[PDB]
Amino acid sequence: RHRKVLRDNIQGITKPAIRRLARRGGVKRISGLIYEETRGVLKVFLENVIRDAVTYTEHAKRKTVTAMDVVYALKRQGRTLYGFGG
Amino acid sequence: VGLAGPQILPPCRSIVRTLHQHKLGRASWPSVQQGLQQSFLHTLDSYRILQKAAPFDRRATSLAWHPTHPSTVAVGSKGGDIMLWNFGIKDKPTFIKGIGAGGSITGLKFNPLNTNQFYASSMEGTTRLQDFKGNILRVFASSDTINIWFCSLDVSASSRMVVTGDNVGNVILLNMDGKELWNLRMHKKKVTHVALNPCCDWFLATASVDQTVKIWDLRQVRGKASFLYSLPHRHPVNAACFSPDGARLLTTDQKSEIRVYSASQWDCPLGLIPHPHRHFQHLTPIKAAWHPRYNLIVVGRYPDPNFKSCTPYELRTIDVFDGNSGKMMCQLYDPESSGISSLNEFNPMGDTLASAMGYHILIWSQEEARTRK
Amino acid sequence: RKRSRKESYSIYVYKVLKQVHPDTGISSKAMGIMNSFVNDIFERIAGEASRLAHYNKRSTITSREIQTAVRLLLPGELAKHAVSEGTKAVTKYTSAK
Amino acid sequence: VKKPHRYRPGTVALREIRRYQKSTELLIRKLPFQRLVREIAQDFKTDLRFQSSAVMALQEACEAYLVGLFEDTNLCAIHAKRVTIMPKDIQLARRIRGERA
DNA sequence: ATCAATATCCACCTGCAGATTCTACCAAAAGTGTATTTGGAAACTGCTCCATCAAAAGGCATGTTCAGCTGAACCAGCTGAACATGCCTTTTGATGAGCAGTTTCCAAATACACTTTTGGTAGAATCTGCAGGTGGATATTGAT
DNA sequence: ATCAATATCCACCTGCAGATTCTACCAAAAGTGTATTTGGAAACTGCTCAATCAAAAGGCATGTTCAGCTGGTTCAGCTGAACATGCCTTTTGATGGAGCAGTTTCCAAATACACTTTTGGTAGAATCTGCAGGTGGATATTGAT
């Protein structure tokens, strides 16, 4: 058998979920090639933020990533986040 | 690693002739035992056909074999529910319930004397001795205050002693009729497993969450960690079980490791069998076991994407290693049983294996024999 | 028995809310939002004031510097009204010692 | 009634627009997102753990970012007298923001 | 246009998940008083900035002319929404160690006062690469 | 392809605005010593994280339709780049001559700091009620004959 669920990866971010997301942005009609590209885009964003978060985590000699690290890592990219402390 | 797998073959050299060599006196017994270990591995790769299955309620925590008879077994649940089951009987085996919520049996050995009895250690805080019909014969000790309970238990008959471990760090040692001269503390935290040697009578082993496993002398030491030996670890320990021969101690951790300690200089190890049996809350902790008549080891595998696997194919399966070498020799697998084999125990007899998975009990004997007229 | 102590701006936000809309409540998440918002604005303003001070080789942060930073960061009419409130506050505080 | 009732193309999408814009619950499921984060983090440093609220915060940030991106995408699309977004639109928007990659 | 379908709004009902109110008590905030800056008034100076003139002068205002561009009808085809279905993922509740978060304490790390150099910097005295100039070889362009 | 008209690029020269180097010297760096504070290795402990199995809820992979969106074709305007001309806003360059940037003094105001005494902000135990959810009934938006 070969499942590895659909890639054991980003492909669990299913199509209709992206559809709902595009619906939030007011969009009506989407092409079939969008999905994959969006996924790649998402990955890049996450990568950068997570990297920074992990780096903050590494400075405190912890093995648990806290919310605060995510907040700060987001703040440095100009995407400050409210509602989780800081 | 290698030498056996879903694709690779078990059988090494075809030395069976050695039996007659033994009939002549040239070749020595240990080589023969080696060859017949080889034979058992070969036929164990045909245990693959799962004989029998058996359910009951919430969760499995402990397993035990009826010593004299092959097909009989006892098992203990998350909810103080015990079962006794015999194969080839079809008489709808015997049951006994408990509270069901906070009465988790955690240790279970048969009575060496009265086969219709059994010892038990319970989350209620009462190391008890009780019948398969339900009547409790005797409590042996007690917490006398809830939220402090026992976890470990074992007994010896040649010496007539009982031993039991707590959830905080202290061990108790009773006679088969009470008469307690013990309850000095041994550890700092919960004692997960503990056992007595069968070939001597009077040195003991205990293991704990303290990243330490300790060997005692129950007649000579009285001074609260005037112990005999103490072996450290990198992680906690889920189980420490002796050999039948008495010279090889086996130890199995919570993160990723197995260790073989020997008679010779308890401190240093002989060999490390890396293999994942990662610990977890709702899972039942994993307990390596010897096979009574060879130098084998039997374990349940619980994969880890972070464990550095030497083999590229990592399934949920029962592994079988060699004791005095280090590497593997067999792997049992059968879909429709993709659960995690928490417990595995061979018979004292040598022809049968039991597995305790979550909500399931499995029996692995061979089948598909030829027929009579 | 060991116990820590985490401060916030919660109680004060609650007071203000009861002043402006007596028959209205507010959830914990939103109060957290307001807490983070206050912390963010505080940090921006203090940092900007610091930068102004350092650029003019003055070692004291005063009301003047805060006023300047406010005019820089915020736009238009919001700045003017807030500045009004600030000046009124200073005038009241300085008199009734 | 004989034939199944059938809405014309576009209407149900609009219905989805109004329904999801009126509410606020997260649209992506927790678990896959957890697994994604865990995989990527594993490739930088091993055996890390994550608090739940951190995952929630990443979820909020990602969804807000994507929403903004699709918004600019849709504007760029409208600029070309189309109604269908395409990859080059997304590329255009990201290139203009400077979120290069 | 009018009739059924279906989605959605709106009136009404109930118990619980946060919302709200009531204790102790201790870290936090105000008060005295003193030690210590420190920023604004006054007095000066020289750098830089601002209103004028004049001689080009390169650049800007205007006016033609036409070759490429911007849209506007039209249509093939494609491609992606609607919907049904079964199935597969996801959700959610069962009552152990690990790690975030404190508390001690002192060996290492580093601020502060003063003296001794010394490298960095303003300004005078040389250098020189390159902005202008001149001349000639292609390189594009564009008509034929 | 083949031939005229300008635009761009190479070669060779030359003097000067800017670059580089050489002094004097004075505000930082280093040393030394001593006073002060701090970060990180041990002792605890109470919240939270790691992931399985069983039973059930809700959503997704797939496959069938078909409306209308894309995108290429062709064509009627139209309007915006080339380029000529003449005049005129700007460059440059000079000069004056007011005003402000920046120094230097200094002292009356302001504020950090070491205590002492109040006090309200916050953890945690008792109440509570608005809203999530649920039931039921009435209007709105799609869409077909």
PDB file of N, CA and C in Angstrom, chain B residues 33-62:
ATOM      1  N   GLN B  33      22.878 -26.000  21.318  1.00  0.00           N
ATOM      2  CA  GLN B  33      21.877 -25.021  21.701  1.00  0.00           C
ATOM      3  C   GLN B  33      21.858 -23.876  20.713  1.00  0.00           C
ATOM      4  N   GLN B  34      23.013 -23.530  20.158  1.00  0.00           N
ATOM      5  CA  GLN B  34      23.054 -22.486  19.154  1.00  0.00           C
ATOM      6  C   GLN B  34      22.302 -22.920  17.912  1.00  0.00           C
ATOM      7  N   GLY B  35      22.514 -24.160  17.501  1.00  0.00           N
ATOM      8  CA  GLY B  35      21.888 -24.629  16.280  1.00  0.00           C
ATOM      9  C   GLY B  35      20.390 -24.756  16.438  1.00  0.00           C
ATOM     10  N   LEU B  36      19.950 -25.149  17.615  1.00  0.00           N
ATOM     11  CA  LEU B  36      18.527 -25.315  17.817  1.00  0.00           C
ATOM     12  C   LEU B  36      17.848 -23.982  18.056  1.00  0.00           C
ATOM     13  N   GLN B  37      18.583 -23.005  18.582  1.00  0.00           N
ATOM     14  CA  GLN B  37      18.110 -21.627  18.556  1.00  0.00           C
ATOM     15  C   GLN B  37      17.868 -21.208  17.126  1.00  0.00           C
ATOM     16  N   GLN B  38      18.798 -21.573  16.260  1.00  0.00           N
ATOM     17  CA  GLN B  38      18.653 -21.286  14.849  1.00  0.00           C
ATOM     18  C   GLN B  38      17.393 -21.942  14.308  1.00  0.00           C
ATOM     19  N   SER B  39      17.158 -23.186  14.714  1.00  0.00           N
ATOM     20  CA  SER B  39      15.982 -23.913  14.252  1.00  0.00           C
ATOM     21  C   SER B  39      14.710 -23.211  14.683  1.00  0.00           C
ATOM     22  N   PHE B  40      14.689 -22.753  15.925  1.00  0.00           N
ATOM     23  CA  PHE B  40      13.494 -22.116  16.451  1.00  0.00           C
ATOM     24  C   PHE B  40      13.241 -20.806  15.745  1.00  0.00           C
ATOM     25  N   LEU B  41      14.302 -20.102  15.375  1.00  0.00           N
ATOM     26  CA  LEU B  41      14.111 -18.885  14.607  1.00  0.00           C
ATOM     27  C   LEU B  41      13.509 -19.208  13.252  1.00  0.00           C
ATOM     28  N   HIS B  42      13.984 -20.288  12.642  1.00  0.00           N
ATOM     29  CA  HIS B  42      13.500 -20.647  11.320  1.00  0.00           C
ATOM     30  C   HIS B  42      12.018 -20.958  11.364  1.00  0.00           C
ATOM     31  N   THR B  43      11.602 -21.752  12.339  1.00  0.00           N
ATOM     32  CA  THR B  43      10.183 -22.066  12.427  1.00  0.00           C
ATOM     33  C   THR B  43       9.384 -20.890  12.963  1.00  0.00           C
ATOM     34  N   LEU B  44      10.042 -19.943  13.631  1.00  0.00           N
ATOM     35  CA  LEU B  44       9.353 -18.758  14.123  1.00  0.00           C
ATOM     36  C   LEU B  44       8.975 -17.854  12.977  1.00  0.00           C
ATOM     37  N   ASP B  45       9.746 -17.889  11.900  1.00  0.00           N
ATOM     38  CA  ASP B  45       9.289 -17.170  10.715  1.00  0.00           C
ATOM     39  C   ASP B  45       8.070 -17.816  10.060  1.00  0.00           C
ATOM     40  N   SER B  46       7.555 -18.918  10.603  1.00  0.00           N
ATOM     41  CA  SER B  46       6.268 -19.478  10.233  1.00  0.00           C
ATOM     42  C   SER B  46       5.266 -19.420  11.370  1.00  0.00           C
ATOM     43  N   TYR B  47       5.590 -18.730  12.463  1.00  0.00           N
ATOM     44  CA  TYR B  47       4.556 -18.338  13.409  1.00  0.00           C
ATOM     45  C   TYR B  47       3.616 -17.283  12.833  1.00  0.00           C
ATOM     46  N   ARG B  48       3.937 -16.733  11.653  1.00  0.00           N
ATOM     47  CA  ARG B  48       3.254 -15.580  11.072  1.00  0.00           C
ATOM     48  C   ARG B  48       1.743 -15.718  11.063  1.00  0.00           C
ATOM     49  N   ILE B  49       1.227 -16.938  11.042  1.00  0.00           N
ATOM     50  CA  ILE B  49      -0.210 -17.141  10.986  1.00  0.00           C
ATOM     51  C   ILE B  49      -0.728 -17.006  12.411  1.00  0.00           C
ATOM     52  N   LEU B  50      -1.435 -15.917  12.658  1.00  0.00           N
ATOM     53  CA  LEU B  50      -1.986 -15.619  13.963  1.00  0.00           C
ATOM     54  C   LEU B  50      -3.080 -16.599  14.303  1.00  0.00           C
ATOM     55  N   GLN B  51      -2.888 -17.338  15.379  1.00  0.00           N
ATOM     56  CA  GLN B  51      -3.855 -18.366  15.713  1.00  0.00           C
ATOM     57  C   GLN B  51      -5.143 -17.755  16.231  1.00  0.00           C
ATOM     58  N   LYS B  52      -5.078 -17.053  17.359  1.00  0.00           N
ATOM     59  CA  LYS B  52      -6.300 -16.662  18.051  1.00  0.00           C
ATOM     60  C   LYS B  52      -6.258 -15.222  18.516  1.00  0.00           C
ATOM     61  N   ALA B  53      -7.459 -14.687  18.704  1.00  0.00           N
ATOM     62  CA  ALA B  53      -7.674 -13.324  19.144  1.00  0.00           C
ATOM     63  C   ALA B  53      -8.663 -13.347  20.288  1.00  0.00           C
ATOM     64  N   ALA B  54      -8.520 -12.383  21.177  1.00  0.00           N
ATOM     65  CA  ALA B  54      -9.412 -12.281  22.315  1.00  0.00           C
ATOM     66  C   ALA B  54      -9.552 -10.840  22.801  1.00  0.00           C
ATOM     67  N   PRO B  55     -10.777 -10.284  22.829  1.00  0.00           N
ATOM     68  CA  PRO B  55     -10.987  -8.966  23.426  1.00  0.00           C
ATOM     69  C   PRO B  55     -11.531  -8.971  24.837  1.00  0.00           C
ATOM     70  N   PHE B  56     -11.463  -7.800  25.449  1.00  0.00           N
ATOM     71  CA  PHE B  56     -12.245  -7.435  26.609  1.00  0.00           C
ATOM     72  C   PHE B  56     -12.234  -5.901  26.678  1.00  0.00           C
ATOM     73  N   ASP B  57     -12.543  -5.334  27.847  1.00  0.00           N
ATOM     74  CA  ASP B  57     -12.741  -3.888  28.009  1.00  0.00           C
ATOM     75  C   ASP B  57     -11.423  -3.113  28.064  1.00  0.00           C
ATOM     76  N   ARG B  58     -11.449  -1.891  28.601  1.00  0.00           N
ATOM     77  CA  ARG B  58     -10.609  -0.760  28.223  1.00  0.00           C
ATOM     78  C   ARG B  58      -9.150  -1.008  27.835  1.00  0.00           C
ATOM     79  N   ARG B  59      -8.281  -1.511  28.705  1.00  0.00           N
ATOM     80  CA  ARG B  59      -6.878  -1.505  28.304  1.00  0.00           C
ATOM     81  C   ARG B  59      -6.087  -2.586  29.010  1.00  0.00           C
ATOM     82  N   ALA B  60      -5.039  -3.049  28.332  1.00  0.00           N
ATOM     83  CA  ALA B  60      -4.136  -4.054  28.866  1.00  0.00           C
ATOM     84  C   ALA B  60      -2.954  -3.400  29.545  1.00  0.00           C
ATOM     85  N   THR B  61      -2.590  -3.926  30.696  1.00  0.00           N
ATOM     86  CA  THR B  61      -1.481  -3.426  31.478  1.00  0.00           C
ATOM     87  C   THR B  61      -0.507  -4.497  31.885  1.00  0.00           C
ATOM     88  N   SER B  62      -0.940  -5.743  32.014  1.00  0.00           N
ATOM     89  CA  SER B  62      -0.012  -6.756  32.471  1.00  0.00           C
ATOM     90  C   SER B  62      -0.409  -8.133  31.996  1.00  0.00           C
TER      91      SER B  62
END
